[PDB]
Amino acid sequence: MNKVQAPARPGAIAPLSVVIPAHNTGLGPEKTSFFQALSIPTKISKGTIEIINDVHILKPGDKVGASEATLLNMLNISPFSYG
Known part of the structure; x- marks a missing residue:
């Protein structure tokens, strides 16, 4: 894989049903501001x-x-496509 994480960019429409899993994101405790955001x-x-x-x-x-x-970029989740 190379571009597994699709270019999540503000303004684009959400085509898929993206779900942030109930699991540690790997992100530092600071990113909870974004999650809460x-x-x-x-x-x-x-x-x-x-x-x-x-x-x-x-x-x-x-x-x-x-x-x-x-948030989705920090989650390393693909809200569009992964190639």
């Missing part, structure tokens, strides 16, 4: 921010926001 229930696991409830971050027909795009 997208109204996400968060708890710190291993010095990393973890998700407690599977988040319906993107919805087919929604519109990827700024901190939202950033």
Whole structure:
């Protein structure tokens, strides 16, 4: 894989049903500000921010926001395509 993470960019429409899994994101506890920015229930696991409830971050027909795009980019999740 190379471009597994699709270019999540604010302004683009959300075609897929992206879900932020209830699992440690690998991100530092600081990123919980972004998770909470997208109204996400968060708890710190291993010095990393973890998700407690599977988040319906993107919805087919929604519109990827700024901190939202950033969130998905930090999550290393592909809200579009992976090639």
